[PDB]
Amino acid sequence: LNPMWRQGMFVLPFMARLGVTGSWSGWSITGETGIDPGFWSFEGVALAHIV
Amino acid sequence: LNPMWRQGMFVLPFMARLGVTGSWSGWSITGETGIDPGFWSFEGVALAHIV
Amino acid sequence: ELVNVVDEKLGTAYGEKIDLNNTNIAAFIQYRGLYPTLAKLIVKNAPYESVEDVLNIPGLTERQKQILRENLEHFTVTEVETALVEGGDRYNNGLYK
Amino acid sequence: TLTYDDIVGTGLANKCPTLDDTARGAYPIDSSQTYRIARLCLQPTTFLVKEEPKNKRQEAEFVPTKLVTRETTSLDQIQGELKVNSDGSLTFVEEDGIDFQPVTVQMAGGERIPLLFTVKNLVASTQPNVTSITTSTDFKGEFNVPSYRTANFLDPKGRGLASGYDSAIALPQAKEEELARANVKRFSLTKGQISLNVAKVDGRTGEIAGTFESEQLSDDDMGAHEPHEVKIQGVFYASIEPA
Amino acid sequence: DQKLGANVGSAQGPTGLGKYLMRSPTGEIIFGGETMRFWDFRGPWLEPLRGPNGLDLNKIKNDIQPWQERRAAEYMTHAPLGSLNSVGGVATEINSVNFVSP
Amino acid sequence: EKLAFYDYIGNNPAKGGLFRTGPMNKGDGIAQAWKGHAVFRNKEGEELFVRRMPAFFESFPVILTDKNGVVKADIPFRRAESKYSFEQQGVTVSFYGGELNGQTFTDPPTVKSYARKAIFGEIFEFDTETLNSDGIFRTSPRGWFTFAHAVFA
Amino acid sequence: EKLAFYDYIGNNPAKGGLFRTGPMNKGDGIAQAWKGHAVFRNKEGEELFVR
Amino acid sequence: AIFRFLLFFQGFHNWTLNPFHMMGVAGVLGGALLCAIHGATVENTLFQDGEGASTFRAFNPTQAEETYSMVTANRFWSQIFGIAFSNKRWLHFFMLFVPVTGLWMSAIGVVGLALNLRSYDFISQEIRAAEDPEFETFYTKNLLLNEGIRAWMAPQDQPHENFVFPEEVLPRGNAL
Amino acid sequence: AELTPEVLTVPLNSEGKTITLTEKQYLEGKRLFQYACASCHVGGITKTNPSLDLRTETLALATPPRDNIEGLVDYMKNPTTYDGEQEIAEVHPSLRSADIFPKMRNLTEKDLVAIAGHILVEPKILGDKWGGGKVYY
Amino acid sequence: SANLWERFCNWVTSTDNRLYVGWFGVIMIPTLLAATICFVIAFIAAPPVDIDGIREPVSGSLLYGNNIITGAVVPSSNAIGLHFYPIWEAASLDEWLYNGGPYQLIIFHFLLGASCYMGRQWELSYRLGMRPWICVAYSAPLASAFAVFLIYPIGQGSFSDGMPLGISGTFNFMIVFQAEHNILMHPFHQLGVAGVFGGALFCAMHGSLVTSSLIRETTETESANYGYKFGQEEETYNIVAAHGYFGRLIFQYASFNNSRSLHFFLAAWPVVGVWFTALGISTMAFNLNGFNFNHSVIDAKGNVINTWADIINRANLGMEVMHERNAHNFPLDLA
Ligand code: CLA
Ligand code: CLA
Ligand code: CLA
Ligand SMILES: C=Cc1c(C)c2cc3nc(c4c5[nH]c(cc6nc(cc1[nH]2)C(C)=C6CC)c(C)c5C(=O)[C@@H]4C(=O)OC)[C@@H](CCC(=O)OC/C=C(\C)CCC[C@H](C)CCC[C@H](C)CCCC(C)C)[C@@H]3C
Ligand SMILES: CCCCCCCCCCCCCCCC(=O)OC[C@H](CO[C@H]1O[C@H](CS(=O)(=O)O)[C@@H](O)[C@H](O)[C@H]1O)OC(=O)CCCCCCCCCCCCCCC
Ligand SMILES: [Ca+2]
Ligand SMILES: [Cl-]
Ligand SMILES: [Fe+2]
């Protein structure tokens, strides 16, 4: 009932469309837990671009 | 219980110290009614300076 | 409604006399010959349903029971308060000089 | 056997003893000879936190959590009598020991969930008629879960229960009805459930081992907010002796 | 406090950490309080209380020797704390004990 | 009421902060009415007096003394050995003139509440809603004029 | 619930305004739960339908 | 008697949290840096005007050439720090500006403390700290230190007030 | 405002009888108090057990009474718990344990009396300070 | 290629680089970059840290409710003490951030780099044929960073007692220090402010005198600074006119006339003063504190006559009594 597109998320969906659906903090777009996104999480992608 | 110096008035007291204690709208600093401040009201004073 | 149990306790017998069910062990030092041996026994031996129940502590010598009877007027008894008894606070409530 | 220095820093100290795959026998109960537990030990493996189903009641499940503290979880040196009951059952009654360890775990969001993992005042029981303790001889019972923080604890603005400030001294003329909950400290006390299921016995030396599962509430921070429901799974080790 | 009838093993301090005994980050049973930083200390007076997992609750409960108690008291009251003008104690102490650890 | 209003520390220019902007009403709120003079007494009937707050202090403890200045009651920090808690002393408060005129309060929280307020002098009723006040004292125009001209000079 | 949520005009992109800034949650609010399907009837028992 | 004046301003005014004071220390501390760095720079970029090792005698009291290599000084700091002076006239005015400006800012802060118009608190912080008992910053920590300073000092520091603070009303942590 | 012999008059025994110390004794006691007590009893407190102080009132409610020269002197030889139901000379400095507490070897009975006198004179001078801790510093 | 390694060494050592990457630079540059990057990310986004090891997390980052003034990087846990706590010593980063992991990574990398920074201040001076000792002046502020970030924690037995990486956090370190050590009443500290005050003093002294005795080469409506060109032969100010003035302000022989003796004094005073203040922190890292004149002067009866030293002590108790609320269980603070 409270997905990204309700929270005015604009960049987040474009990262989810191509694979990146997890965070280093543990949560995930699909709503799963215990998953290991590796480096390429939302933080990772954001990190990369800044560099 | 709610005088000028409680409402953060800075210029208003200096206008009352020298005579100007009424408004064109009817009220007055002392708290009286029916009074006629003439032209030299707080509005009047403010008006003059602008001119 | 929300209330501070300790401050509320101070409006009872506790806060006027030594509560055998709550008050910290160091309080027994303000009366003659109560502290080391006896106060340990009092505290260690559970709560009491009445002041007099302290005379029934198993093992008490005839002299110990004598001393206790003397200081009964300085004792009271209230409901056991968790905030005051938990964490071993009756042996050390973090208070010193 | 290994000395202190043979354990230091290895983390082995936070590990309950284990039995070999062999030891799967059975320990006998005289029922006319008193028994006690010289050493019960509980070692956590997983901390599960039941998530709040939001407003939308949809039934909630337990979710895994990351251990944000370190290897300080295990309970050890537990002791008490293992009295034999009329119906031929066994009930353990804890006396003393390292019966509690403050644990703090993180969640998906990043929320830290601090809890007081404990088994204080444990009263576990078994099945009726248990002449010999075999593999899987369920122990079940309750324990007490005292407030995470004790009476003397003060919040960052100095307020506390047994000590500290009476109110929000930083807002001298603010309305107090809203701050009520945060000014008035409450001491929480609740019950817990645990079940110790044996997996390895050893009638010779009289030491059993297996796994446990316990449930309890987490810290409510002196009654400032609602506590989380926690499920805790791990392994245990008990040393039974006549005495 | 143990002599006063306190169960040091299960005693809960203000933070809920362990008034007298707690665990080191690797699981060893150590002394509680701010003294958690000095859990690396080894000393003749203290070692006989140490077990294979750190401080043994059983030795602590009934193997404490008198020479150890007064040793602890001695060293406790002779910590390397002092002033330049040699006044033993914390910066807020009163003049009396003229001492500064060598 | 006007006369009583001057005997309230929330009109003291020495109270406030450099970045505590806005009128004094953003602080304690718009004054509505005088609750009345609070008289504190203990079980023996003795009248106690609240030690007022010096301008220097951001926060001040609640202490009650008699005429001779002997401490009879207070609000303890450590309860473990409190001798003068409002509960132990049966402190009560009565009001004369004003909103709370003729009324008496004996329940410790309520009594301690007003005692907590008497520190500031005469107790008043404020409107905190309107201006969304934060309950933190602010200085008067008298304070600001003095500051600016002292710096400028 | 998710399926029912899509059948709500407050998620229709054709609703809103040019200067109605922020996420969709600044509008109707953060969706908490599905109150449920509402069936309307009149005295005769006839089931009615909302346009 | 000056040390207490410091501790007082901390406890009562929270003087360290004042922006005008911070500029103050920045000027003094930064001024004491300029003093050091420039002196060291000059002594270690000197020309050889003598045959002795103690280069002090080798100075010309009657002007003429620059006694130290300004050009070398420039390229040095430009490579270690990235920035460097290149105008002795600006460099020395800068040495005047920094510590004088700092002292003046610290003065203004004190003028505000006269009316007790201090920089004691952050309202946004206090409001959260009130509602939320788990919110703690080094800012919140410091204010608790101030409360202790005020309570324990006031009685003997302000005799004229005839202060009497019962042991029980004294704000204290655990054990201590 | 001086150390009169009026101040140096302290109770000798339980039966009301008193003794008057001299300025030599006081100083000597004060010096000996630093030598063997101050370590744990600085300013009338007890670092290794803050629950029991050297207040005259505390010493009076002791068992036996230790609020006199005689009480204190006996204590320095055969120390007991507050109720007196247990001898603690093994973990407390005393004459019968000078082998364990070397500082007490030198101490002779004069020294004991001086020290005892010191404990009774200080609160007469310092007052609440002598008993309390950092609060009264 | 004349030889790859030979060329590499020539490039590193090259004085034709915009920024002199020295041999010390080979260590400095990477270490300083890790320190800074880790710092910036932490100060903004790091989660609360259980500094006192009492499971009482302290948030000090922007995103977690702080501003510049309050925000800080919180020292490692007291449960860790002096133990080495790298990322690869934690079960997870969540754990690493909770126990104040970043702090060690920063202070260690900084202190290392800041040391090599001193090493480079020699190297470049060597490559350019100028005298050394500039780095010796920088040893004073560095020795302070060392004392505050490393020496004091070593002495006290935990890095949690090291100075936090933040404004308000720095204030806490001081206030507490004063309580536990009475630093204001310590000679080495007093020498420090003497050096710092005198420094600012002499900085203004030298600054003004020189800028006031400038030779005229500028117009009335033209910046007086333009009367100097980069790379001059002769001096831009009348040092003999400067000495003539200052020599009359006090008295001749109490005035400098030797520019070299002047600039030496300008450098010596603050460096030496700060050196002692750094030694002060390093000394009080082993609990050799300031003068204790508590209850010193007493009257003929024995009553305690208070001094300002006592008034200081009351302020100190309050700090002592209130700091680290829930961290203490026992009477004496021996940690
Ligand atoms: C990093 C540490 C640091 C630093 C660098 C500073 C820096 C400063 N502080 Mg400070 N402060 C700090 C931390 C720090 N603070 C902390 C932690 C506290 C505790 C809260 C304070 C509390 C504090 C207070 C309370 C005050 C300062 C003030 C000041 C400023 C003025 C100091 C000065 O030049 O006096 C120089 C003072 C003079 C009066 C100069 C005139 C002296 C004459 C000319 C000398 C005559 C000498 C004579 C000829 C010789 C005879 C003497 C005889 C003995 C021989 C300066 C900007 C002061 C300020 O802002 O004032 C505006 C001030 O009042 N500070
Ligand atoms: C075009 C690309 C684009 C799109 C589609 C979005 C979409 C969105 N952004 Mg976003 N954003 C973008 C680029 C974009 N962003 C960029 C480049 C930045 C960096 C500055 C941001 C920074 C940003 C922030 C900080 C936030 C958003 C938020 C949002 C969401 C709310 C929508 C909103 O507030 O609209 C508002 C739209 C308008 C007010 C329309 C403005 C049109 C102007 C006034 C026309 C100007 C005409 C011109 C002056 C005429 C002169 C010409 C004449 C002389 C000829 C939405 C998903 C919010 C969010 O995350 O939601 C929770 C939020 O808080 N955005
Ligand atoms: C100096 C004369 C003066 C004085 C004493 C006042 C007094 C007052 N004004 Mg006011 N005002 C003035 C001039 C003055 N005004 C002028 C000229 C304007 C036109 C812009 C206004 C516009 C104005 C508005 C719009 C409002 C007030 C309000 C108020 C009241 C609230 C006070 C307040 O918010 O302070 C706040 C004070 C500060 C935040 C102090 C700022 C100090 C700065 C940050 C220092 C800067 C240092 C500098 C950058 C350092 C760099 C130097 C370095 C490089 C060396 C108070 C009665 C309010 C009111 O009516 O109350 C109900 C209100 O809403 N004023
Ligand atoms: C606390 C620090 C401090 C002190 C003690 C100090 C001292 C001095 N600075 C002077 C000068 C200067 N100071 C300057 C910039 C600075 N000075 C600074 C900080 C200081 N400067 C800072 C930070 C700066 C940078 C802005 C300049 C630019 C000058 C000068 O031109 C001048 C000089 O010649 O430099 C060498 C001298 C003025 C002599 C004078 O007027 O005597 C005559 C007047 C007398 C004797 C009356 C003074 C009476 C004072 C007000 C009361 C003192 C009370 C007691 C006597 C003192 C003891 C009390 C203490 C224990 C607190 C004097 C030696
Ligand atoms: C884990 C290992 C990671 C390995 C990293 C990968 C290799 C490093 C790649 C570097 C890429 C970035 C280039 C930067 C260019 C530059 O700096 O100037 C370019 C100049 C020009 O010279 C230079 O440039 C010349 C070519 S040209 O002129 O630039 O075209 C060249 O000929 C000459 O050799 C050379 O000196 O380089 C220099 O002057 C050399 C010094 C460079 C200093 C590095 C930064 C120092 C940081 C100190 C710590 C700061 C702390 C944080 C500060 C906020
Ligand atoms: Ca939750
Ligand atoms: Cl603190
Ligand atoms: Fe110069």
CB burial of residue J294 (10 Å; 0-12, 13-18, 19+):
buried
> What phi and psi values does residue H173 have, to the nearest 5 degrees?
-80, -165
Q: How many residues does chain C have?
A: 97
In a domain, C93, yes or no: no
Q: Select from H38, H23, H2, H4 the least CA-distant residue to H152.
A: H4
What CATH fold (topology level) applies to the domain D21-149+186-243?
Answer: Porin (2.40.160)
Per-residue DSSP letters for chain F? Answer: -HHHHTTBGGG-TTSSBTT--S-GGGTT-EEEEEEEEEEEE-TT-PEEEEPPPPTT-SS---EEE-TT--EEEE--S--TT-SSBHHHHT-EEEEESSTTTT-EE-SHHHHHHHHHHHTTBSEEEEE-TTTT--S-----HHHHHHHHHHHH-
Q: In angstroms, what is the resolution?
A: 5.9
Query: Does residue D112 sit at the H interface (CB-CB below 8 Å)?
Result: no
CB D243 within 8 Å of CB D34: yes
Which residue in J149, J111, J130, J87 sits closest to J27, CA to CA? J111
Beta bridge partners of I27: none
Residue E69 belongs to what H/E stretch? helix E66-76
Q: Which residues of J touch E80 (CB under 8 A)?
A: 286-287
J20-59 b/e (C-beta count within 10 Å ≥ 16 → b): bbbebbebbbebbebbeebbeebbeebbbbbbbbbbbbbb
Using the 8-state DSSP alphabet, how is residue I19 labeled? E
10 Å CB burial of residue H86 (0-12, 13-18, 19+) is middle
Phi-psi label, residue E89: left if phi above 0, alpha if psi -120 to 50, beta otherwise: left
CA distance J104 to J87: 10
d(CA H92, CA B50): 47
DSSP at J133: -
Burial of G35 (0-12, 13-18, 19+ CB in 10 A): exposed
Strands E82-83 and J288-289: parallel
CA distance F113 to F60: 14
Contact status of D109 with chain A (Cβ, < 8 Å) = yes
Provide the token pair at J226. 């333009």
Residues 6+ away with beta carbon under 8 Å from B25 = none
Residues of J in contact with E38 (CB under 8 A): 81, 157, 335
Binding residues of H for Fe cation: 38, 92
- φ, ψ for residue D34 (rounded to 5)? -60, 145
* Rounded Cα distance, E9 and D96, in Å: 7
Distance, CA of E81 to CA of G9 (rounded, Å): 73
For the record, the structure tokens of I136 come out as 């009264």
Separation CA H113–CA H111 (nearest Å): 5
**D58 CB-near residues (< 8 Å, 6+ apart):** G1
* Sequence-separated (6 or more) residues with CB below 8 Å from residue C58: none
**Secondary structure of chain D in the HEC alphabet?**
CCCCCCCCCCCHHHCCCCCCCCCCCCEECCCCCCCEEEEEEEEEEEEEEECCCCCCCCCCCEEECEECCCCCCCEEEEEEEEEECCCCCEEEEEEEEECEEEEEEECCCCCEEEEEEECCCCEEECCCCCCEECCCCCEEEEEEEECCCCCCCECCCCEECCCCECCCCCCCCCCCCCCHHHHCCCCCEEEEEEEEEEEECCCCCCEEEEEEEEEEECCCCCCCCCCCEEEEEEEEEEEEECC
Other beta carbons within 10 angstroms of residue A21's beta carbon come to 19
Question: Could you give the C-alpha distances from I106 to C17, F111, I99, J135, in angstroms and in order?
Answer: 46, 61, 11, 58
Give the residue carrying structure tokens 């045959």.
H51
Residues of J in contact with C97 (CB under 8 A): 331
| Nearest CB to D151 within list C2, C3, C6 | C6
Residue J271 phi/psi, 5° resolution?
-55, -45
* J298 vs J304: CA distance, rounded Å: 4
d(C-alpha H101, C-alpha H103), whole Å: 6
What tokens were used for J133?
Answer: 């000792």
Tokens of D234: 């791990």
CATH of the domain at C2: 1.10.150.320
Distance CA I124, CA D18 (A): 66
From the CB of residue E26, how many other CB atoms can be counted at a distance below 10 Å? 19
Is I35 exposed, middle or buried (CB count within 10 Å of its CB: 0-12, 13-18, 19+)? middle
User: Are F85 and C7 inside 8 Å of each other by CB?
Assistant: yes
CA distance D214 to D193: 5
Please, what is the Cα angle at F15 between F9 and F19, to 5 degrees? 145
Going by alpha carbons, the residue nearest to atom 54 of ligand 3 is H101
Contact E77 I38 (CB under 8 A): no
The full DSSP string for chain H is --HHHHHHIIIII-GGG-HHHHHHHHHHHHHHHHHHHHHHHHHTSB---SSSSSTTTT--SS--B-SB-HHHHHHHHHHHTS-----HHHHHHHHHHHHHHHHHHHHHHHHHHHTT-B----HHHHHHHHH-TT---HHHHHHHHHHHHHHHHHHHH-GGG-----GGGS---S--
Domain of residue I30 covers 2-137
Q: Which of residues 314-333 of J touch I (CB under 8 A)?
A: 314, 317, 320-321, 331-332
- The CA-CA-CA angle for residues F77, F81, F85, to 5°, reads 60
Q: Is residue C92, in this structure, part of any structural domain at all?
A: no
Residues B48 and B41 sit within 8 Å (Cβ to Cβ): no
Decide: residue E91, CB within 10 A, 0-12 exposed, 13-18 middle, 19+ buried.
buried
Residue B30: strand, helix, or coil = coil
What's the Cα-to-Cα distance from F98 to each of D175, D178, F1, F94, F112, rounded to whole Å?
A: 20, 26, 8, 12, 20
Q: Cα(H14)–Cα(H7) distance, rounded to whole angstroms? A: 9
- Please give the full DSSP string across J210-270, using - where no structure is assigned: HHHTBPP-S-TTS-GGGG--SS-SB-SB-HHHHHHHHHHHS-GGGS---HHHHHHHHHHHH
3-state SS, residue I126: helix
CB distance I63 to I79 below 8 Å: no
> Which CATH number characterizes residue J82's domain?
1.20.85.10
Rg (CA), chain B: 11
Q: How far does CA G37 lie from the centroid of its chain?
A: 11
Residues in chain I: 137
CATH of domain D150-185: 3.30.2050.10
- Total domains in chain C come to 1
Residue J34 C-alpha from the chain's centroid: 20
Domain boundaries, given as residue ranges, for chain D: 21-149+186-243, 150-185
Q: How far apart are CA F12 and CA D77, in angstroms?
A: 62
Task: Give the CA angle between residues I46, I28, I57 to the nearest 5°.
Answer: 40
Tracing tokens 């004691």 back to the chain, one arrives at H120
Distance CA J125, CA D31 (A): 89
Experimental method of this PDB entry: X-ray
Q: Please give the Cα distance from H87 to J94 (Å, whole number).
A: 52
Chains C and B touch (3+ CB pairs under 8 A): no
- Measured in whole angstroms, the distance separating CA G15 from the mean position of its chain's CA atoms is 12
- J32 Cβ inside 6 Å of ligand 5: yes
* Separation CA D127–CA A51 (nearest Å): 64
CATH number where I132 lies: 1.10.760.10
Residue J11 token pair: 């490039």
- Domain F1-138 falls in which CATH fold? Photosystem II CP47 reaction center protein (3.10.680)
Q: What is the 3-state secondary structure of I90-124?
A: CCCCCHHHCCCCCHHHHCCHHHHHHHHHHHHHHHH
Cβ of J286 less than 6 Å from ligand 5:
no
Instruction: Provide the CB-side half-sphere exposure for F75 (13 A, CA).
Output: 20
**In whole angstroms, what is the distance from residue G46 CA to residue G37 CA?**
17
If DSSP states are collapsed to H, E and C, what string results for G1-41?
A: CHHHHCCCHHHCCCCCCCCCCCCHHHCCCCCCCCCCCCCEE
Please tell me whether residue B34 adopts helix, strand or coil conformation. coil
Q: Note the Cα F125 to chain centre separation in Å.
A: 12
Residue J263 among known ligand-binding residues:
yes
Dist. CA J248–CA I89, nearest whole Å: 76
Task: Calculate the alpha carbon distances from G5 to A29, E59, G12 in Å.
Answer: 18, 65, 11
Measure the CA–CA gap between H175 and C8, rounded to whole angstroms. Answer: 24
Q: How many CB atoms lie within 10 A of CB I13?
A: 13
Task: Using alpha carbons, list the distances in angstroms from residue A13 to A6, A34, A41, G5, H130.
Answer: 12, 21, 13, 19, 38
d(CA J201, CA H102): 12
Pick from E92, E93, E97: CB nearest I39: E97
Distance CA J191, CA C69 (A): 67
- Does J15 sit in the ligand 5 pocket, CB within 6 Å? no
Ligand 8 centre to CA of H68 (Å) is 10
Half-sphere exposure of H112 (CA within 13 A, CB side): 25
Q: How many residues belong to chain D?
A: 243
E97 three-class SS: coil
Q: Which residues of D touch H141 (CB under 8 A)?
A: 156
| Displacement of CA F46 from its chain's centroid (Å) | 21
Residue E50: in which H helix or E strand, if any? strand E50-51
Q: Which residues pair with D217 in a beta bridge?
A: D229
